[PDB]
Amino acid sequence: ANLWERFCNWVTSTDNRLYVGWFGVIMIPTLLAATICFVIAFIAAPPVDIDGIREPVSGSLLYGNNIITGAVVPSSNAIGLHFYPIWEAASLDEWLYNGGPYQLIIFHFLLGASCYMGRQWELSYRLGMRPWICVAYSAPLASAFAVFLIYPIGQGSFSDGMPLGISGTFNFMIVFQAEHNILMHPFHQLGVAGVFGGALFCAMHGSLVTSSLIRETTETESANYGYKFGQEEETYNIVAAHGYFGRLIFQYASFNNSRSLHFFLAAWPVVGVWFAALGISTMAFNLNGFNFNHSVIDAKGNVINTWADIINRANLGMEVMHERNAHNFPLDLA
Amino acid sequence: TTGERPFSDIITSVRYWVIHSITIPALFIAGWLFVSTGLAYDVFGTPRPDSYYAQEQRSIPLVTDRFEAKQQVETFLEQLK
Amino acid sequence: ERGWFDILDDWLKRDRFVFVGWSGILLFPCAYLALGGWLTGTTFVTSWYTHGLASSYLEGCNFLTVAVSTPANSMGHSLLLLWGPEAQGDFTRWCQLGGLWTFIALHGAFGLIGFMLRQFEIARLVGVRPYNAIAFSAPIAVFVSVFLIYPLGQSSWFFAPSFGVAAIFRFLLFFQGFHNWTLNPFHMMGVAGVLGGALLCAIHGATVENTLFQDGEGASTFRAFNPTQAEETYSMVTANRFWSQIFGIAFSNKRWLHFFMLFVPVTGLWMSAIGVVGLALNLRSYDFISQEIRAAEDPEFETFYTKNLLLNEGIRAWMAPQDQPHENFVFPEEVLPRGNAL
Amino acid sequence: METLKITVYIVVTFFVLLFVFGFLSGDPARNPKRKDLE
Amino acid sequence: ATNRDQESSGFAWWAGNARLINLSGKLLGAHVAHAGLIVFWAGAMTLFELAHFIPEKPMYEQGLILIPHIATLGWGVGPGGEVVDTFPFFVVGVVHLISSAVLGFGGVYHAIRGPETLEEYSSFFGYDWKDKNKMTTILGFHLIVLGIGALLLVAKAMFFGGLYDTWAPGGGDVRVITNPTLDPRVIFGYLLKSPFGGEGWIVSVNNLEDVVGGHIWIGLICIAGGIWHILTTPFGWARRAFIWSGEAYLSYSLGALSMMGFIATCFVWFNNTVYPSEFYGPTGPEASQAQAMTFLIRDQKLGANVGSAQGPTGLGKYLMRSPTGEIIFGGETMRFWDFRGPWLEPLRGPNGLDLNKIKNDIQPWQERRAAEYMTHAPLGSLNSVGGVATEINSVNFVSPRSWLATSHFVLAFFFLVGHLWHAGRARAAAAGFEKGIDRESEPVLSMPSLD
Amino acid sequence: AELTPEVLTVPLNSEGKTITLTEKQYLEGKRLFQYACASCHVGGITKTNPSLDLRTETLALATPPRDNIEGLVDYMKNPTTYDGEQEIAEVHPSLRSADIFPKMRNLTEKDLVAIAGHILVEPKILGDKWGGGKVYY
Numbered sequence A: 001a002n003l004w005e006r007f008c009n010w011v012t013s014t015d016n017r018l019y020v021g022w023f024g025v026i027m028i029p030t031l032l033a034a035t036i037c038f039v040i041a042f043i044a045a046p047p048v049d050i051d052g053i054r055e056p057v058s059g060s061l062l063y064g065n066n067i068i069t070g071a072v073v074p075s076s077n078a079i080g081l082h083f084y085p086i087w088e089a090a091s092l093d094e095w096l097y098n099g100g101p102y103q104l105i106i107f108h109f110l111l112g113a114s115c116y117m118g119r120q121w122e123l124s125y126r127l128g129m130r131p132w133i134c135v136a137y138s139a140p141l142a143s144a145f146a147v148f149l150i151y152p153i154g155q156g157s158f159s160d161g162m163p164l165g166i167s168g169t170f171n172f173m174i175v176f177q178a179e180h181n182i183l184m185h186p187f188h189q190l191g192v193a194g195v196f197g198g199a200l201f202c203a204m205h206g207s208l209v210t211s212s213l214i215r216e217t218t219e220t221e222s223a224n225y226g227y228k229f230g231q232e233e234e235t236y237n238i239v240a241a242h243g244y245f246g247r248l249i250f251q252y253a254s255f256n257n258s259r260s261l262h263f264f265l266a267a268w269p270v271v272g273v274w275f276a277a278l279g280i281s282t283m284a285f286n287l288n289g290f291n292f293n294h295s296v297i298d299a300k301g302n303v304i305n306t307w308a309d310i311i312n313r314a315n316l317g318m319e320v321m322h323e324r325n326a327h328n329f330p331l332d333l334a
Numbered sequence B: 001t002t003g004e005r006p007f008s009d010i011i012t013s014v015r016y017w018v019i020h021s022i023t024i025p026a027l028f029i030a031g032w033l034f035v036s037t038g039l040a041y042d043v044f045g046t047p048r049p050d051s052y053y054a055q056e057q058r059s060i061p062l063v064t065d066r067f068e069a070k071q072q073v074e075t076f077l078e079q080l081k
Numbered sequence C: 001e002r003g004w005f006d007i008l009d010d011w012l013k014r015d016r017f018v019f020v021g022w023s024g025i026l027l028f029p030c031a032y033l034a035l036g037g038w039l040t041g042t043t044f045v046t047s048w049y050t051h052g053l054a055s056s057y058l059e060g061c062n063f064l065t066v067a068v069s070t071p072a073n074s075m076g077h078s079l080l081l082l083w084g085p086e087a088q089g090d091f092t093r094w095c096q097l098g099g100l101w102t103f104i105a106l107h108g109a110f111g112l113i114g115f116m117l118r119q120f121e122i123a124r125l126v127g128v129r130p131y132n133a134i135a136f137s138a139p140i141a142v143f144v145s146v147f148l149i150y151p152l153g154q155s156s157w158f159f160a161p162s163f164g165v166a167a168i169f170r171f172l173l174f175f176q177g178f179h180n181w182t183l184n185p186f187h188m189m190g191v192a193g194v195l196g197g198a199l200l201c202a203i204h205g206a207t208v209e210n211t212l213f214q215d216g217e218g219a220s221t222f223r224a225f226n227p228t229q230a231e232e233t234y235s236m237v238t239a240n241r242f243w244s245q246i247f248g249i250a251f252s253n254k255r256w257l258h259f260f261m262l263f264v265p266v267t268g269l270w271m272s273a274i275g276v277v278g279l280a281l282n283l284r285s286y287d288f289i290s291q292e293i294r295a296a297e298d299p300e301f302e303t304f305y306t307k308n309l310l311l312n313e314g315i316r317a318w319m320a321p322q323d324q325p326h327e328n329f330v331f332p333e334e335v336l337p338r339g340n341a342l
Numbered sequence D: 001m002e003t004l005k006i007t008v009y010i011v012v013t014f015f016v017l018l019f020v021f022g023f024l025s026g027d028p029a030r031n032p033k034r035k036d037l038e
Numbered sequence E: 001a002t003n004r005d006q007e008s009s010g011f012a013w014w015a016g017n018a019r020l021i022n023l024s025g026k027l028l029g030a031h032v033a034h035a036g037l038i039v040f041w042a043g044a045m046t047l048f049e050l051a052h053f054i055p056e057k058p059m060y061e062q063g064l065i066l067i068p069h070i071a072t073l074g075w076g077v078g079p080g081g082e083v084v085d086t087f088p089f090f091v092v093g094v095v096h097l098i099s100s101a102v103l104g105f106g107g108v109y110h111a112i113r114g115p116e117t118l119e120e121y122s123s124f125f126g127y128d129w130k131d132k133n134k135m136t137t138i139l140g141f142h143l144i145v146l147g148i149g150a151l152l153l154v155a156k157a158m159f160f161g162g163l164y165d166t167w168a169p170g171g172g173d174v175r176v177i178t179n180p181t182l183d184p185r186v187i188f189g190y191l192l193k194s195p196f197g198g199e200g201w202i203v204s205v206n207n208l209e210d211v212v213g214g215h216i217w218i219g220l221i222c223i224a225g226g227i228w229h230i231l232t233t234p235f236g237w238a239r240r241a242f243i244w245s246g247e248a249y250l251s252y253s254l255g256a257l258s259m260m261g262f263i264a265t266c267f268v269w270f271n272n273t274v275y276p277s278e279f280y281g282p283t284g285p286e287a288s289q290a291q292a293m294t295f296l297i298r299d300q301k302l303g304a305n306v307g308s309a310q311g312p313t314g315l316g317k318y319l320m321r322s323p324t325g326e327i328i329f330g331g332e333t334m335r336f337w338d339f340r341g342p343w344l345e346p347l348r349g350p351n352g353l354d355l356n357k358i359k360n361d362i363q364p365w366q367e368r369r370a371a372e373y374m375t376h377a378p379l380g381s382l383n384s385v386g387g388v389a390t391e392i393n394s395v396n397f398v399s400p401r402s403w404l405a406t407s408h409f410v411l412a413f414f415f416l417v418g419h420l421w422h423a424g425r426a427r428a429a430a431a432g433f434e435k436g437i438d439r440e441s442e443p444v445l446s447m448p449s450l451d
Numbered sequence F: 001a002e003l004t005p006e007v008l009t010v011p012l013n014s015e016g017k018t019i020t021l022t023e024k025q026y027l028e029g030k031r032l033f034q035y036a037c038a039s040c041h042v043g044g045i046t047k048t049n050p051s052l053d054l055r056t057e058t059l060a061l062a063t064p065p066r067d068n069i070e071g072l073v074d075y076m077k078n079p080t081t082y083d084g085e086q087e088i089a090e091v092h093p094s095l096r097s098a099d100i101f102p103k104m105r106n107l108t109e110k111d112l113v114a115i116a117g118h119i120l121v122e123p124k125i126l127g128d129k130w131g132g133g134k135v136y137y
């Protein structure tokens, strides 16, 4: 074998402790750059003029933040969707003021995480597996694309991308509610059904398999020792599990087929989260939640408030207060 | 199986549909009339569109006393003239 | 021994389409009434006298905006029994006073007890360990903390969640503006357990479906499984290698994997419940004191934390007069907090 | 500015070329089963 | 019935169309019948739009997406995009609707009556997915067809009345394109432009000369490529790079359509040339700029000196500099300074927005347009309540730009998913493990332990 | 509460004369106001100039007075600035500028009266909400 042939054999080797592969050739450097920049920025970055109004917001630990308040702050509204790599700045000091780290991080991250998804297909192929784990990962990935790329595109600025920080995330959520009434949007509602249901079914499946473990141990040892890695025989009794759950509800509401059950476990959260991602990605173009403001009117024409109108009052509070020095004109159009 | 007649047997039988082409429409119509006669408003105490406010009133008839709450509502209802 | 008790026990535990049990005597009426009460209220019942809201299909609300709303604040924590001193046996007045709220909450609570007893009862009869019932303690801790303990620590049932889609959304936004509930590490642990549970659900389902053994000739692979088969339907060994190489670690023990799937969302929900118990008393994680001391002295110091409090202050001022009508709030235009232009 | 830019451009080009030529290097054959897919 | 249950086909009902992979006749029917559905919708939707259409309201106030496509081609409209004749819209709708019956007829025939496989019937129409030469030949036919399609657009623009030109001197109007851009430096230059702000890759195309010239190129490229693929068979390196199967080819096309979907989303969101704002409403960037313009005009009429007016932050309230110094509108719309539109451009000088032009040269038609666009911003609820999320019910409006961007993002996204699903499946099926791991030949069991 | 003949009774002119609109005129007025005006005047405010609203008290202090049917109908034909000083048909929808505001092309005299009646009746129903903006939502 020549050098290229050998290199290819190593890259695609099924024997590396962590699989590299061709997607990994892009994933490794991009994820390392994003990680390193993030860590350094989160600790040490100076304040960033997120809203382009010369009002710098401090995100880093050394500049007065704790783990909860800290963030890498989105790039300046003055930049908008302009590409702002380090070399476009006159200095690192300028780059930092304008939120250059945010762009470097999210672009390397999105590239790296897309390659992470490809890499999941890639290894499944090398191991002779079925290929669709990567399709499940497309759900959180799509969600990351929605908040870091698609929303900024629709609104015309990376300053409206989700901040890389715990409190910045909450800021993004509250402002999103004000501007899109996301709670009243059916795609976010499907998302909630996806994650509440995902958690429910996770607990359900956990509890049912755990409930029907076949006795292989004594009381002075963990029942976990009753299963040995790679054993051929199933470790629980699915017939007893189905016997239980089918009586809890009724026979035909319970799965007796493990393949069907596990498919449902994959599908429910993944589809819901795809809708969550699509909610963000379509509210990115301002097709917003249901608006029933003043929908109910009496015989004279008096407005009779519903809970929708109370939501509206909360939303107004968010709207009027957010970015309190950034608006000069009466309508918030992006 | 648990001994009851299969649902698919029942709902593909003529007798089920002889019974239920009567009972289902009967229930639906009874529900309809519960509303269309206005009885629903009376049973539950729900305002009709002309009964949220007196003509010139713009204040909500909020219950403000726990133990005289019944009378308060009755007083609010009287004030609709 | 063959008395009436044992004969009743026999009938209760007959293997039928819908199992009944001793637990059924509690469960079925309470669940039926809770659900029936919700459907009845959302269809026909107003919230005009308690909230100044329309809340039923009858009044023109849709599925998103209908609710059974909490009683007026002036009711305090009254049980609001139909035969109690407020409604005095009058079904109509009882509806107008929010009696259906305590009706649903209380039958709901006893119904949940019945459901968990049902989980125990069936597990015992079938001869399985009662981990499903144990896991259900999380839904119960949430229901009890949010629908009972929270309003009990507040002024009245008025501040419990109203049973409705939009009403629940209002409850979320209230908790943000008033409690800064996103900042609370007990809610944060709840979020991690819910999202972590959804993650585990998806990843485990997908891993099993993608490490299946070929056990049939069909390209649709569901038929190639038999409930009574002894063998694992998928390869733990291949799954383990895949994740070890992709992510760095992997499950190797199926019993541990499935216990963890119980542990994560159950623990999350239990954590969120503890935070809500604090909120019953306004014992919030509202502020970081060091942040406030700095920001008060230094008008150039700004974080996402200070930004979110401005949002909260807007929520409170803008929503309170209509959301809390018993307070009779009148906030002149000039006092309302607003940024420039908006 | 300029040296950094050129350096990153070269780095990115390097890895992209690896990705493309790598997947071009008989990738369908790199599996545990049927290799004759040409 | 051949292959029409799970036992014989290996595919369950919910994967039923996979039963068609190797049945070229029935599969032709599926495809032709489906082309029928697309043509049916195009025709029926147009007639529906026309029946609902009020000529003196803007199209974008009327939930129209198809009439705007016809109007952009220069049919039925005059100066400013005013509707002068609805008959071209009627023709487009009827002719599609009639054509769909024909396609539906052929589809139904092939699907249930005609020969199930075409190979025994005809060597020309029959095909084996694995026959690389036959695959490239059929691909070649379709490329020629597509090239002719692109030249049809060129024909309309140059020889059959022209296209609607929002940029036309003295005001938007239908205009014949006599000098299409042929220079490959300009045409392919778009393809190498950055997709980021102020650049916008192909989405930045801002004049009909470039649009028409692009389609001349694309038409010729597609016809040349088609001939190429009829006359050649895939080279060795291509043979070793791809999976050669029906499902693989589907996956490649799903990937391509996904990409196109996202591009179309950005096209309708930002571009106001091939999506004239007269027909589609203002872009998000456009309406935000139009707001700043509106209040600059208002306050300047009241006596404000808008050049020297300092806002609360220290930046100009109405006017400020971009990061490269160009004079741009201020407030949040600073992000939208790359916006370009016929109503704004007359105020633009070498250095950006010109203060002397602003002070002296703003015409009433500019005020009207800015006010119109500001109050038809592409914001609105799912139930079509126009405006911000806190707005009251009153205006029934969601911009066609929002409808078209959101729908196409959703479609593009699910098509990426379909690409991954089918590409991963095509690989696994080709290698022989799509149904699961062979218990007696589990690959991982022959591999050394990781540790 | 009901939409009574009294609620529907509004000033015809500045000289003390009233007109009682029918329920159908009220409905037509809402519809036509939504069709031609609400894009800028939703809820009684003005989006392109929030300083000027459609409140009755505001219309009364306009020149010429606009707090009556005649004043409003005239506004819709020949709109002026608030002091009556300039004619603004070139930048404001009117019958006189139906050429540049094409939605005004199909409005009849009857339609203008219905729109005028809407503007006067709505605050009698909605109070401060009419012309109040988001504060009163």
Ligand code: CLA
Binding pocket: C025, C026, C029, C030, C033, C079, C080, C081, C082, C083, C099, C102, C103, C104, C106, C107, C110
């Ligand atoms: C197991 C089923 C079940 C359970 C646990 C409950 C429980 C409840 N109901 Mg529901 N209900 C049920 C079934 C049930 N109900 C059914 C089937 C109906 C249809 C008829 C209803 C209709 C209903 C209505 C309309 C209302 C309730 C209400 C209530 C609450 C108060 C009840 C109370 O105070 O009782 C007190 C009585 C007991 C606890 C029984 C005690 C039995 C003891 C052990 C025997 C002693 C009695 C003795 C012989 C009498 C001698 C007295 C003498 C000195 C005069 C509570 C949550 C109220 C509520 O929800 O308000 C918000 C209410 O208004 N229920």
Ligand code: CLA
Binding pocket: E002, E003, E004, E005, E012, E013, E014, E015, E016, E017, E018, E019, E020, E023, E026, E027, E029, E030, E031, E033, E034, E101, E102, E104, E105, E108, E111, E112
């Ligand atoms: C665009 C939608 C579409 C199209 C064009 C097709 C096309 C086809 N499918 Mg698929 N399928 C679809 C969606 C579609 N399918 C969906 C959504 C599902 C899930 C429910 C399926 C599940 C499925 C299964 C399980 C199977 C097919 C099969 C087939 C083929 C044979 C059908 C047959 O034998 O009919 C028999 C039915 C009839 C004779 C009844 C009448 C049907 C005709 C076509 C209706 C025409 C109505 C129309 C209004 C008439 C206009 C005429 C006018 C122009 C003159 C046919 C090529 C079969 C196949 O693969 O065989 C090898 C097969 O087994 N399909």
Ligand code: CLA
Binding pocket: A271, E045, E048, E049, E052, E062, E063, E064, E065, E382, E384, E400, E403, E404, E407, E408, E410, E411, E414
């Ligand atoms: C590109 C696709 C597209 C777009 C952008 C539009 C756009 C529009 N249409 Mg048109 N139309 C379409 C396709 C489209 N339509 C189709 C397929 C039909 C046949 C049913 C129609 C028939 C039609 C009629 C009869 C009317 C419109 C009207 C309208 C307008 C209002 C829409 C509305 O209120 O939505 C309401 C929103 C919904 C109903 C929600 C849709 C959500 C879907 C179900 C989610 C899809 C998710 C995904 C694709 C599924 C994947 C699942 C996953 C698990 C794999 C708007 C301009 C109205 C109009 O104004 O005409 C002048 C009108 O009356 N359309």
Ligand code: CLA
Binding pocket: E028, E032, E102, E103, E105, E106, E107, E109, E110, E114, E115, E118, E122, E125
């Ligand atoms: C992609 C579309 C397509 C393709 C590849 C085929 C292919 C085939 N057809 Mg089907 N069919 C179609 C669509 C198609 N058909 C449509 C739309 C209809 C309804 C009119 C039919 C109705 C039909 C019937 C009734 C029969 C066939 C038959 C055949 C076979 C022989 C055809 C032949 O000898 O032509 C030789 C060439 C000619 C006769 C001259 C073609 C003249 C064309 C129409 C000129 C216009 C071309 C133009 C570019 C089309 C643009 C359309 C575009 C706008 C959509 C062959 C397998 C026969 C069969 O299968 O035998 C058992 C048969 O009996 N077809």
Ligand code: CLA
Binding pocket: D020, E136, E139, E143, E191, E192, E221, E222, E224, E225, E226, E228, E229, E232, E233, E234, E235, E238
């Ligand atoms: C539907 C359109 C279509 C499709 C599906 C094909 C399919 C095929 N072509 Mg054909 N071709 C077409 C149209 C098409 N062609 C046209 C219009 C022309 C005239 C220009 C040609 C001229 C042509 C030639 C000369 C050759 C092919 C070849 C091939 C084969 C391999 C192609 C390949 O490896 O791509 C993958 C692409 C590459 C390996 C190029 C480098 C990839 C870069 C890095 C991607 C950059 C793009 C990126 C996504 C961003 C886009 C913007 C960018 C421009 C900046 C395959 C059968 C080969 C063949 O075997 O001939 C028989 C071959 O030599 N085609």
Ligand SMILES: CC1=C(/C=C/C(C)=C/C=C/C(C)=C/C=C/C=C(C)/C=C/C=C(C)/C=C/C2=C(C)CCCC2(C)C)C(C)(C)CCC1
Binding pocket: C032, C033, C035, C036, C037, C038, C039, C040, C103
């Ligand atoms: C309260 C009360 C009571 C009771 C009652 C009851 C019990 C009731 C009931 C009731 C009921 C029991 C009702 C009902 C109902 C219902 C309904 C109303 C429904 C519906 C529905 C729907 C509408 C559906 C739909 C849908 C869905 C959800 C799914 C999917 C799709 C669709 C859309 C199809 C009593 C007397 C004791 C006493 C006092 C009080």
Ligand SMILES: CC1=C(/C=C/C(C)=C/C=C/C(C)=C/C=C/C=C(C)/C=C/C=C(C)/C=C/C2=C(C)CCCC2(C)C)C(C)(C)CCC1
Binding pocket: E029, E030, E033, E034, E036, E037, E040, E094, E097, E098, E100, E101, E103, E104, E105, E107, E108, E111
């Ligand atoms: C295969 C298949 C399928 C499918 C199918 C299809 C897809 C089809 C189609 C189809 C079609 C696609 C069709 C059609 C049609 C059409 C028509 C039938 C037409 C017509 C028309 C007309 C008649 C007209 C008229 C008119 C005029 C002229 C003018 C104006 C008015 C009017 C409108 C009246 C399915 C899924 C079922 C399944 C099984 C198989």
Ligand SMILES: CC1=C(/C=C/C(C)=C/C=C/C(C)=C/C=C/C=C(C)/C=C/C=C(C)/C=C/C2=C(C)CCCC2(C)C)C(C)(C)CCC1
Binding pocket: D019, D020, D021, D023, D024, E186, E187, E188, E190, E191, E202, E205, E210, E211, E212, E213, E214, E215, E217, E218, E241, E242
């Ligand atoms: C019309 C028009 C125009 C033009 C245009 C043009 C001229 C174009 C084009 C175009 C083009 C010219 C394109 C393209 C492309 C391409 C592509 C899209 C590709 C791809 C690829 C791939 C997919 C690959 C793959 C792979 C790899 C990477 C590695 C190994 C393996 C494989 C083979 C798998 C303008 C703008 C002026 C204006 C307006 C209109």
Ligand SMILES: [Cl-]
Binding pocket: A171, A175, A321, A322, A323, A324, C307, C308
């Ligand atoms: Cl903010």
Ligand SMILES: [Cl-]
Binding pocket: A326, A327, A328, A329, E330, E331, E332, E333
């Ligand atoms: Cl602004």
Ligand SMILES: [Cl-]
Binding pocket: none
């Ligand atoms: Cl005022």
Ligand SMILES: [Fe+2]
Binding pocket: A205, A209, A262, C204, C208
């Ligand atoms: Fe499992």
